[PDB]
Design a protein around this ligand. Structure first.
Ligand SMILES: Nc1ncnc2c1ncn2[C@@H]1O[C@H](COP(=O)(O)OP(=O)(O)OP(=O)(O)O)[C@@H](O)[C@H]1O
Ligand SMILES: Nc1ncnc2c1ncn2[C@@H]1O[C@H](COP(=O)(O)OP(=O)(O)O)[C@@H](O)[C@H]1O
Ligand SMILES: Nc1ncnc2c1ncn2[C@@H]1O[C@H](COP(=O)(O)OP(=O)(O)O)[C@@H](O)[C@H]1O
Ligand SMILES: [Mg+2]
Ligand SMILES: [Mg+2]
Lengths: 52, 173, 460, 513, 52, 458, 85
């Protein structure tokens, strides 16, 4: 059983990582869409056209 | 679908049009023929087995904007093989071969909203350092992307959008 | 709002053309007004140019070209849950009996992915049917598939009713019965046999018989299987009967031929072993519940090499065969103990005592098989005198394999018995080793447990 | 303990920190058709054959055809949720798979994605799934032994590192037992193992992995699984994705052992993929190149000389020779060892172990039928002692098993045939062996000594198993150093022959059994 | 061990609630070059925390 | 000047300017990334398109790659310099040694020698194998073929023939491995090199790893080497390790070339593809080629089109069988199905011929009793048909022999049995002069005195 | 949909003059070559079973007179022949 406990620890750690991982980006999307403006838009477009 | 059977006819019609400097007339000719192909009544005729020569004559008659000899001969040749439904694709591949020969390109620019007309200038300038062709943009407005810009040039695209930046991160995790 | 248009109709196959930007995904369901009643089409393939090729879940007579087709955005969905117990439904989940609407609160799609690798149960239990022959010679795994190979007239349906009864009463499970492409007469006089044995309240019936078009006989098994999966999600033990899996294979072949796909090994569809696996793989145990399956199987041309038998047997754990002969001797259930097999018979899984008790009775029976030929040719008096005792123990074993079912009362009068495995092991460990040599062979017949064999001998 | 939120948070934030935001240009096309798992794509001028195309969702398709105006592809996953008009993006990568010793102990999808719950992989880069095996000058002849647990196969049918050894037989004959026992027996012998299950039931894998973890072997195995429910393409490309992980160790001078659970279900999934593309079938409806399918796969199980391991590894490894050992499993209907796919794979491997249902019903397990089974490398692989004690034992039993045919109703030459029968019968009673009971070469060796120096002329058939069970404990109490020595070397000398004769007289004369 | 793991899970999750906000802000500020503040987004990050 | 326009599996389509289209069988060249790929054009479709087979892995080919036209067929080194070296299908050296120093290169596509130039010889080759040179003797400058299913012995028999005839003969030799194991090519390369006979053998390999084009053309490369040595007036040995794989690689590619399937999915041109090869492997008035060809028969079906069309192209045909090998009787030759053009009273003498035919007749009469023996058991037979059965069961064992190359499998030392010493022994058995021995006295022995001796040990 | 020897420059020829001149009718041009069968374009006056004469001293048998082509088999080595002959 010393291995079947370890498998359960690894698996729980993985599921926890998964939830935090999806929350990170799901939140980042809301932060972006809430905090953009045409200066921020211009900076990005003008940076990327300069490597076009 | 006609993508493949339309290639030889497009190439032959373009080659012929170049020798006689009338490419700009041939394109109108082919477009009008592809339009008579889309009519409700004609589309019924084209589908029902009828002898190629009679189908060709009854299709020619419905056009007078066609170069007497060299335009109608294409119609007769396609009728021989039954490929008259292909005209809407012969047109597209004709336009494409012309755009190649004239070294011209067309690119979509997709953005959250309208650009500043200096951004448009720099884009329509740099794309020609990517492509040897002259470019005509056709800006577009798309709110699914929420910042940045998409530049699609044929089947090559440069995804400068923030939406792309997001789903290209969510997958790293 | 309707957006499609029929553009071809050839047999059961219907092609409909949508706008480029709204083509239905595969296995979605459409519907059309086939005159005075709606018809449901299931999408099978996406061709170029918005055209999508479908198969009609009904009769395609009377369909014009140009009819308007409305696109439902979801696969076929059926009513699930407690509300379906005691009802009859067709593939589309419509009540086929005359008892009105199903009051279901929830409806599930029939197309689904199998349990993922880590949902599976981390154990291997046994399903106690309560039947001596089955629990001894061919035990059931909880979550395994079981084949039922007997012919006709031997009692397949009374055995099915017995299992339906016991898994409802002793455990707290429910049963689902899916009739794939079999005679409507059988379905009716099965419904009536179940209704007047009080078991109808504990089983849910979904029939798609031979009369139905190919699509119905194809998808009816998935309808039944999704109702069983709903019961499983409630944490129950379920028992799913498929009344003939070979007809599921053959409906797959018919549809495959309609869609124009190239013939594979013996005319069978190219995708045979996948259409079978994507059914048989949803029938498994799980950390929440389990589905056991009892599947009647027909082998073509008496050939266990034909691709369909060979593809099915890859999935069957147990296998019970019913013999006309065992029934001729008045022994019910007529399970042939020598040809019935399971792959749960290993000391690793069932234990050493059960395993070797089963192997013991098997060797006894198959020796008696040849002594009973020596007898028939030379007469009893030739046999050695230890064999005159083997021929007395084999007869007692062969009797003790009979049982009174609850469902069998209205034939046999005697009340029903449900025998715990341990008791069967006791009884056969006894009979095999001379214990109970002293009491007559008719004290074992139709008794139930062995500690009632003695109390039937008492009064003999 | 190890649920340290600091560790998880940094594990994420380091990925964030090194996310190269810079945009990049790619080639793009449209799905034009969808049917039975085949995709027809439109555009993608710069696609290349064998390329991985990335579909919406996060899943891949493999380019099979570059037609004049479209790209035919198959979907490596569930294909229903696709629809005409979806955009697909061409990655630059030919079909690839993660490789590295960090996969050991993981259960992995055929695309490399992990399927147990234990999270993302640790891997040393990627490897191409389709590759051509080392040439004729890079090979080396197989010499080293690979011990299974079984008296029958290690004596009669020896397997060497770098060999390919078909396991063939009818359903429910122990084909999988004989394979996972070989895997288990490498628990401590420096050979990594790989087990790829093609078209098996999901519960059977969930059980095999539990046995592998029970006996402690899982920490040394990769597992690749494509269950019976999964797409034909994933089932078809699985064994290539397993070989791609075995060749990682092969090319570094390490050794690996790979077990294809069914190369018969791979052939069936390829026949499906092939008939859905309208390719004219041949015998038994299998495509034309169903031979080349298995050929280019099994030709990768090889042994390579040290010059090749030097050249491949930029000279980091000297003197070591790597190898990959394959045990493909085939299933045959009704015991017909002479059908198209079974015969095609017999003509590829280097021998076959034939497990016979008639023997397996009669309790003779493992049911190794001698006379039909062979090893094409033969004794070159065996340890010196095993090559001695074994001798031609397998032809002795091959003869015995036809002598029993005619000797059934009578016996003539009826002294020597009597001794011959009573001998071979105790031999076969000795070769049967319980599942999950692997016995080392020392034990197998002195058992074969007992059997072949006449030491079992005395004891009954009934006592054979108890003779062995007591002998193996006697010699474990009283003569441990000799076992410690035979296990360490091939270890055959007339000195040791005398030691064994003495041990087998002493035991025989006083120990109980 | 199962009960031990199910307690350690809460122990880790509740403090991960304190990291999710750092992750979301770091992600936003990587994808967008214009750094951003908490005040304009506090009521958004707090919902993420509440849903862990 | 060309462009790729399709890539279907192994076959690539290339488009050229209307006036520059390559000829058939010319070799094109493409750069498959950081590598070079050679294509051989098979068909001229219309309009500048040309359809080709790739002599390499097709993976990684984009459409629209530029292809260069080499205006000559595939050409391979040939002659003295190609001796003792391993070569690719394209004639490139595949051992790590230097470049081949060839003076001359030949196109691998050639026409067969005229009927006017052929020659024939009755000069027997005495191999040491009892069964082969009793039942199926073969002659200098003739063709032999070993037919059998998987794992019946057609490679080990070819290696014993190599050992016996190939070293006791002076001229050069060629071994073309078509579509077989690379392990068995490496083991043979080293067996040669470790005995200083490698420098009389030229090796060519297109083993089973390789994509269909290599397996398709490697046999013609080997033939071209053998033909160069023949035209020099020498006499050559040519061993071909599995000729079935040439037709199988043709099948694998046929349908992509757009050709309708035929009898069992085989290409429609099976018999022409097969004849265009087997016709140029022949001796002639200037020099001779002896050859031995292994011919795999799929599914053990000796009536499949592929063996059925090959039987006609051989002088001596040796048919191996699984239902004999499973008895342990190696070499597992079936003497009722082996045959040779050379088995005539005028060629082998009346006594050899008479013994071979008496053996055939006894074994056939034994075949006709196997069903009576099966059903009724053996005790129903006559006193004169129990004796036939016993003599046939002795002749069966005595056809077995130990091979110098099977020592690896059984240790028993190989035996070499001369022809006189076997047409004496079979006469002995048929006339009952050895009736007093047990059957096992004959199993795996050499001459008949080894059996009369082994009987003493029982 | 499949093409049937409608190739760019033949179509262009027909563009310039659909009502093509006689062009003898006792002459055509090889448009395809493969496995010993050649597809000939023209030969309006070919007859079934007629011997068609090729460059060199060779012949073919016209077997598949068809709407566009005359499909003929070469009586000898064919690999020499080339489109446009
Ligand atoms: N050495 C042995 N002794 C006793 N029983 C054995 C032995 N090896 C295998 N078995 C039994 O054989 C049964 C089937 O074995 P196994 O599953 O390996 O065969 P298989 O061919 O893989 O089956 P399938 O073909 O369904 O995969 C197992 O239940 C096992 O108990
Ligand atoms: N357990 C049993 N007890 C009594 N009679 C039985 C039993 N099983 C079968 N029989 C007899 O055999 C018959 C089998 O009929 P039925 O079950 O309808 O066959 P089928 O399987 O074809 O439907 C019963 O009606 C009864 O006569
Ligand atoms: N003469 C022989 N003596 C002993 N064993 C043999 C003999 N010939 C063949 N065998 C056995 O049979 C197998 C035949 O191998 P091989 O000849 O390579 O078959 P093939 O080449 O026809 O596929 C060998 O591995 C060997 O073990
Ligand atoms: Mg198995
Ligand atoms: Mg061979």
């Amino acid at each position: 059983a010393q291995a079947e406990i370890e498998a359960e620890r690894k698996r729980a750690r993985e599921e926890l990582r998964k939830q935090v991982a999806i929350l990170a980006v799901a939140g980042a999307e809301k932060i972006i869409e809430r905090s953009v403006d045409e200066a921020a838009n211009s900076d990005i477009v003008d940076k990327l056209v300069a490597e076009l | 679908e006609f993508i493949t059977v339309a290639r030889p006819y497009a190439k032959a019609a373009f080659d012929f049009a170049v020798e006689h400097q009338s490419v700009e007339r041939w394109q109108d000719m082919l477009a009008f023929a592809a339009e008579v192909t889309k009519n409700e009544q004609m589309a019924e005729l084209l589908s029902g087995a009828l002898a190629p020569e009679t189908l060709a004559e009854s299709f020619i008659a419905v056009a007078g904007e066609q170069l007497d000899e060299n335009g109608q001969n294409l119609i007769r040749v396609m009728a021989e093989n039954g490929r008259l439904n292909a005209l809407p694709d012969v047109l597209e591949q004709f336009i494409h071969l012309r755009a190649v020969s004239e070294a011209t390109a067309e690119v979509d620019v997709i953005s959250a909203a309208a650009l500043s007309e200096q951004q448009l200038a720099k884009i329509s300038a740099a794309m020609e350092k990517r492509l040897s062709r002259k470019v005509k943009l056709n800006a577009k407005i798309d709110k699914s992307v929420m910042a940045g810009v998409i530049i699609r040039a044929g089947d090559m695209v440069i995804d400068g959008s923030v939406r792309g930046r997001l789903e290209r991160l969510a997958d790293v995790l | 709002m309707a957006t499609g248009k029929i553009v071809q109709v050839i047999g059961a196959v219907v092609d409909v053309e949508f706008p480029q930007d709204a083509v239905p995904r595969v296995y979605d369901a459409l519907e059309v007004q086939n005159g005075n009643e709606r018809l449901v089409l299931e999408v099978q393939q996406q061709l170029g140019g918005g055209i999508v090729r479908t198969i009609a879940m009904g009769s395609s007579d009377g369909l014009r070209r140009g009819l308007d087709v409305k696109d439902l955005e979801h696969p076929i969905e059926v009513p699930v849950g407690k509300a379906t117990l005691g009802r009859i439904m067709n593939v589309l989940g419509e009540p086929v009996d005359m008892k009105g609407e199903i009051g279901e609160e929830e409806r599930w799609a029939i197309h689904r992915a199998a349990p993922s690798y880590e949902e599976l149960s981390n154990s291997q239990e046994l399903l106690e049917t309560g039947i001596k022959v089955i629990d001894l010679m061919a035990p059931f795994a909880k979550g395994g598939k079981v084949g039922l190979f007997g012919g006709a007239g031997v009692g397949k349906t009374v055995n099915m009713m017995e299992l339906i009864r016991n898994i409802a009463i002793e455990h707290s499970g429910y049963s689902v019965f899916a009739g794939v492409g079999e005679r409507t007469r059988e379905g009716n006089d099965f419904y009536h046999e179940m209704t007047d044995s009080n078991v109808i309240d504990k089983v849910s019936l979904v029939y798609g018989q031979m009369n139905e078009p190919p699509g119905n006989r194809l998808r009816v098994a998935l309808t039944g299987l999704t109702m069983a999966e709903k019961f499983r999600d409630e944490g129950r033990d379920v028992l799913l009967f498929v009344d003939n899996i070979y007809r599921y294979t053959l409906a797959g072949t018919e549809v495959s031929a309609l869609l124009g796909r190239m013939p594979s090994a013996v005319g069978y569809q190219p995708t045979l072993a996948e259409e079978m696996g994507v059914l048989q793989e949803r029938i498994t145990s799980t950390k929440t519940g389990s589905i056991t399956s009892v599947q009647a199987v027909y082998v073509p041309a008496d050939d266990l090499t034909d691709p369909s038998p060979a593809t099915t047997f890859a999935h069957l754990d147990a296998t019970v065969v019913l013999s006309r002969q065992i029934a001729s001797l008045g022994i019910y259930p007529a399970v042939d103990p020598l040809d019935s097999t399971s792959r749960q018979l290993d000391p690793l899984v069932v234990g050493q005592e059960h395993y070797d008790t089963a192997r013991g009775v098997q060797s006894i029976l198959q020796r008696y098989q040849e002594l009973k030929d020596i007898i028939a040719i030379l007469g009893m008096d030739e046999l050695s005198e230890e064999d005159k005792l083997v021929v007395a123990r084999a007869r007692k074993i062969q009797r003790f394999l009979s049982q009174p079912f609850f469902v069998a009362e209205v034939f046999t009068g005697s009340p029903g018995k449900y025998v715990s495995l341990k008791d069967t092991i006791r009884g056969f460990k006894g009979i095999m080793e001379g214990e109970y040599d002293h009491l007559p062979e008719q004290a074992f017949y139709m008794v139930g447990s062995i500690e009632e064999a003695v109390e039937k001998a008492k009064k003999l | 303990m190890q649920l340290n939120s600091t560790e998880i948070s940094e594990l994420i934030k380091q990925r964030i920190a090194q996310f190269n935001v810079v945009s990049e240009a790619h080639n793009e096309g449209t799905i034009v058709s969808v049917s039975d798992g085949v995709i027809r794509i439109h555009g993608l001028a710069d696609c290349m054959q064998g390329e991985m195309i990335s579909l919406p969702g996060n899943r891949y398709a493999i380019a099979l055809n570059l037609e004049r105006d479209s790209v035919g592809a198959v979907v490596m996953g569930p294909y229903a949720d696709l629809a005409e008009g979806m955009k697909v993006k061409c990655t630059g990568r030919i079909l690839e798979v993660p490789v590295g010793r960090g996969l050991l102990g993981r259960v992995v999808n055929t695309l490399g994605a992990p399927i147990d719950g234990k999270g993302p992989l640790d891997h040393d880069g990627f490897s191409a799934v389709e590759a051509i095996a080392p040439g004729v000058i890079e090979r080396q002849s197989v010499d080293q032994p690979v011990q299974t647990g079984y008296k029958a196969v290690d004596s009669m049918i020896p397997i060497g590192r770098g060999q390919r050894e078909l396991i063939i037989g009818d359903r429910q004959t122990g084909k999988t037992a004989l394979a996972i026992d070989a895997i288990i027996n490498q628990r401590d012998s420096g050979i990594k193992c790989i087990y790829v299950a093609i078209g098996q039931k999901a519960s059977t894998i969930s059980n095999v992995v539990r046995k592998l973890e029970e006996h402690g072997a899982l920490a040394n195995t990769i597992v690749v699984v494509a269950t019976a429910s999964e797409s034909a393409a994933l089932q078809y490309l699985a064994p290539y994705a397993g070989c791609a992980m075995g060749e990682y160790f092969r090319d570094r001078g390490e050794d690996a052992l790979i077990i294809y659970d069914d190369l018969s279900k791979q052939a069936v999934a390829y026949r499906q993929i092939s008939l859905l593309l309208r390719r004219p079938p041949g015998r038994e409806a299998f495509p034309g190149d169903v031979f080349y399918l298995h050929s280019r796969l099994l030709e990768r199980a090889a042994r390579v000389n040290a010059e090749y391991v030097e050249a491949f590894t930029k000279g980091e490894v000297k003197g070591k020779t790597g190898s990959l050992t394959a045990l493909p499993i085939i299933e045959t209907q009704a015991g017909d060892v002479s059908a198209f796919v079974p015969t095609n794979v017999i003509s590829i491997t280097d021998g076959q172990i034939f497990l016979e249902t008639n023997l397996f019903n009669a309790g003779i397990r493992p049911a190794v039928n001698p006379g039909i089974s062979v090893s094409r490398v033969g004794g070159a692989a065996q340890t010196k002692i095993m090559k001695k004690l074994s001798g031609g034992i397998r032809t002795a039993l091959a003869q015995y098993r036809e002598l029993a045919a005619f000797s059934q109703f009578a016996s003539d030459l009826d002294d020597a045939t009597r001794k011959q029968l009573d001998h071979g019968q105790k031999v076969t009673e000795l070769l049967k062996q319980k599942q999950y009971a692997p016995m080392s070469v020392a034990q197998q060796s002195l058992v074969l000594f007992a059997a072949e120096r006449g030491y079992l002329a005395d004891v009954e058939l009934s006592k054979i198993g108890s003779f062995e069970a007591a002998l193996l404990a006697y010699v474990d109490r009283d003569h441990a150093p000799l076992m410690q020595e035979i296990n360490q070397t091939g270890g055959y000398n007339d000195e040791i022959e005398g030691k064994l004769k003495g041990i087998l007289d002493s035991f025989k004369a006083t120990q109980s059994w």
